[PDB]
Write a protein that binds this ligand. Sequence first.
Ligand code: OLC
Ligand code: OLC
Ligand code: OLC
Ligand code: OLC
Lengths: 6, 210
Amino acid sequence: AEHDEF
Amino acid sequence: MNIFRLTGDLSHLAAIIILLLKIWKSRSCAGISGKSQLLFALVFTTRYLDLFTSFISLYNTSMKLIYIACSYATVYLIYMKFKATYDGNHDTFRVEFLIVPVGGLSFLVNHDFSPLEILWTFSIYLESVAILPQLFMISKTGEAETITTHYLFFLGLYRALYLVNWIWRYYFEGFFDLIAVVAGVVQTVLYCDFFYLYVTKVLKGKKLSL
Ligand SMILES: CCCCCCCC/C=C\CCCCCCCC(=O)OC[C@H](O)CO
Ligand SMILES: CCCCCCCC/C=C\CCCCCCCC(=O)OC[C@H](O)CO
Ligand SMILES: CCCCCCCC/C=C\CCCCCCCC(=O)OC[C@H](O)CO
Ligand SMILES: CCCCCCCC/C=C\CCCCCCCC(=O)OC[C@H](O)CO
């Protein structure tokens, strides 16, 4: 799954 | 993208600059756990390997590079430039009790058994406990300087704002990541004693004694 946060 | 996420990113960058400028201007890293700064640098290194496989936005790329840059710079000021003021005698947390188990847990409990996902998971578990050596050092030395407490407040508030961000993203976008959530809760509960002492003592002109 794609990680779009820091 | 929501206000809770944006305020959380600003709170995290505020904490990182407060610490970096405090060491740089005072030419001293007294009372600062070098070990926690190694852990934070290691979180950024394992989490942001996706800089080579993805492009989310200029903001996403820039923030990752700034975080890696400031975490590595902070490590350099403590262990190389101002090493004469690094208090190794009081930064005695045994970080192997955090790294070895967190590493083992990321390999076993993750969303996918692939190198990039296992490394991302390691970053999430490690971040939840990364501040432990700094809090342990403050309890040992007895005191925490005002600027050190402002650093800890903005660092602790950042992941608390990410929890609110996850409520927002779950309700409005149907997005949910249980590994980040549970680790985020662990990360924030470790600041509960500090938050209570910062609000009742530091914000009232008193001494923060852990
Ligand atoms: C001299 C040492 C201190 C100097 C540094 C002072 C400036 C940094 C302050 C804030 C950064 C912004 C984020 C933190 C403030 C958030 C406060 C709050 O409650 O935020 C809830 C949020 O706004 C709901 O959207
Ligand atoms: C010197 C100390 C070294 C030891 C440090 C040990 C690790 C940190 C300790 C406690 C965290 C316990 C609380 C964590 C609970 C997380 C579960 C949780 O989030 O439950 C709610 C639900 O999943 C979402 O709403
Ligand atoms: C004292 C030293 C040890 C420190 C340990 C600190 C606690 C954190 C550990 C585990 C998770 C905490 C409880 C949260 C469990 C949530 C499980 C859950 O919701 O599972 C759903 C299911 O797996 C569908 O994904
Ligand atoms: C002193 C030595 C111990 C200190 C180190 C403690 C590390 C932090 C602990 C837990 C992080 C919380 C998240 C872990 C729980 C995962 C919950 C879950 O849902 O797991 C199944 C997963 O979703 C399937 O994809």
